[PDB]
Symmetry: D3
Subunit: 133 residues, 6 copies
């Protein structure tokens, strides 16, 4: 029904690519992309539970949290050392979840020509598997 507290690798179902903080960069504005599996810290996301049912995601060691500065269609998911966006992670199929912020679903954008693309908010076309680290 819900994702329990723990640390996970987060794999997009449609592309088999993993949620990835670009270059493990801890600076604000660093895009959260989907990338080939590495299992490194910038692909390990700590899931923090909140009493209202929402979730927050933070990278191990880097300590940059999933953050969206402007919650509107097309807004980009980034990593931020101090700011975080409260997310709604809802089950769609057994073992497959959607992630949304402010009612807008996360859309996985596969890399193009070797350059990763930030996850964006759509106006569920992207599902995610939460694999325990």
């Amino acid at each position: 029904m819900s994702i329990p507290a723990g640390t996970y690798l987060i794999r997009n179902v449609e592309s088999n690519l993993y949620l990835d903080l670009r270059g493990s960069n801890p600076a604000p504005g660093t895009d959260a992309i989907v990338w080939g599996r590495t299992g490194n810290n910038n692909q390990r996301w700590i899931v923090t539970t909140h009493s209202d049912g929402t979730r927050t995601l933070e990278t191990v060691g880097i300590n940059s949290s999933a953050f969206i500065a402007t919650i509107q269609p097309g807004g980009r998911v980034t990593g931020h050392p101090n700011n975080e966006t409260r997310l709604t992670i809802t089950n769609v199929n057994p073992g497959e979840y959607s992630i949304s912020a402010g009612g807008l679903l996360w859309l996985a954008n596969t890399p193009v020509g070797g350059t990763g693309e930030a996850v964006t908010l759509q106006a569920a076309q992207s599902l995610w598997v939460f694999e325990a680290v």
Copy 2:
């Protein structure tokens, strides 16, 4: 040593004014000011504990969290429906705490001429008392 989980009114020691979400406005960018005591929801802050020792503050009913878009000297504390800034709430004297974001201490700005002023980050001149609601 630390502020435990709970809902609090947060009174600035130096001015006896309370942390207040301006006009109870739930929109992003709404300033967090200090204001005369009302005890209404925009002055009731839920303190959420995190395993790393940080804290996050959310208004009751309004559900806007304490959020700082740019963590630099002079940056303003606002309320945001979906975003939140992880804070460090440290004891200074018995019953008196400092609040900081990204290592920068919160500075209480008393209202001027009837207009509230947003709490800002200084480069501890502002202490806070956490009163259980």
Copy 3:
């Protein structure tokens, strides 16, 4: 709605004086008074929660708990190293609570002539309290 577990300074709203174990004396029969703010151990009260909603208060380091040997109108609140009274801490206004024992509300008595006076129980809410996290 309720006071969560923690350690608090407890200030009387009507007088801005703090719940205070007189002279920090750990002996039985030591009055719990209201006194000027100090922030010392005899003004730090550990709030212990009970499953029925009641609360118990104990001073930090001194380890003397709020205690009422005779729960009747006029009875005095003291500190006791081994005995304690289960209290009902009820919200009256946002951020302002009343304290009662056996259904009798705590009454704050301000000092007279530089001498503190014990909190007492009023007959069957003239005193309210602010719980300030230590």
Copy 4:
């Protein structure tokens, strides 16, 4: 030590149980040892405290174990609002002692068919049986 829970508390030396005399909820009611009944006045809720101490309260009656005068010879009673912080220390596997203010509880068997209140000594072990 004894974990949080509700127990029947039987004295080892007598096989008699901690008993709030007559299920009387008023202050001053003696805490005695009595033949087993299993009723509410023999069901003691053990509450844990972070300093390691314990407090006991009867089920439904809501009278807690209380010692007004914590000196040798003082009597254990039940009180609807007041309670005494106790130390319940393991002596043998499955057998515990109870003390208030460093003074051990002493189980007093009935004299002439009438119950006698537990007293503090300046000798009595207890088995905590989960209700």
Copy 5:
């Protein structure tokens, strides 16, 4: 039901205690009822499960209560890796029954001085004494 904790488990009808025969940690070791010792092979850790069931494990020996064949007459044993999910239901205040697969545990008193393994019946109550 029985809360989580470590207990000595005494059969009411015999006053004998649940006992891992000879403290033997190997599979197939009988779970018997035996005279009180208080040793590790009589200390049972009660683990709670969200469905209401319970599992028992001996302290230090780490052998859990296990029933290979859950049918009338099946024997209760200790096993280092396998365990049987049990239902421990209150019958009277302070007295519990134990069952596996809907079949009650039956305490078997020693025959000729030798312990007899607990068996499942198609009659035995237990007191959980906190260690």
Copy 6:
């Protein structure tokens, strides 16, 4: 480092097949196999944590737990309605774990001729598993 309490689909890395209670049969002696992903109840394993670090697995709704009647090399993993084996679930790589009973690692056996084969214990880590939250 460890698998937290929850309900998981458990996929074998080397074959991308999922731990599967054959035919969802709740009877004792029913093999635990690896099978094509379905997401059904017989592929949903509740992970119960134990204070010593061990773990137990139980199918949702069917209520049959992972069980090894004979813990030896070659012994088969089954589902059992009332008996269960305490397991050691150890991290090998990030996101990839091994499962073992009595110190013997679980070995995934892929189906042959459209017939599933039971997970077995290898002699004293050829099989790894991904725990996917349901």
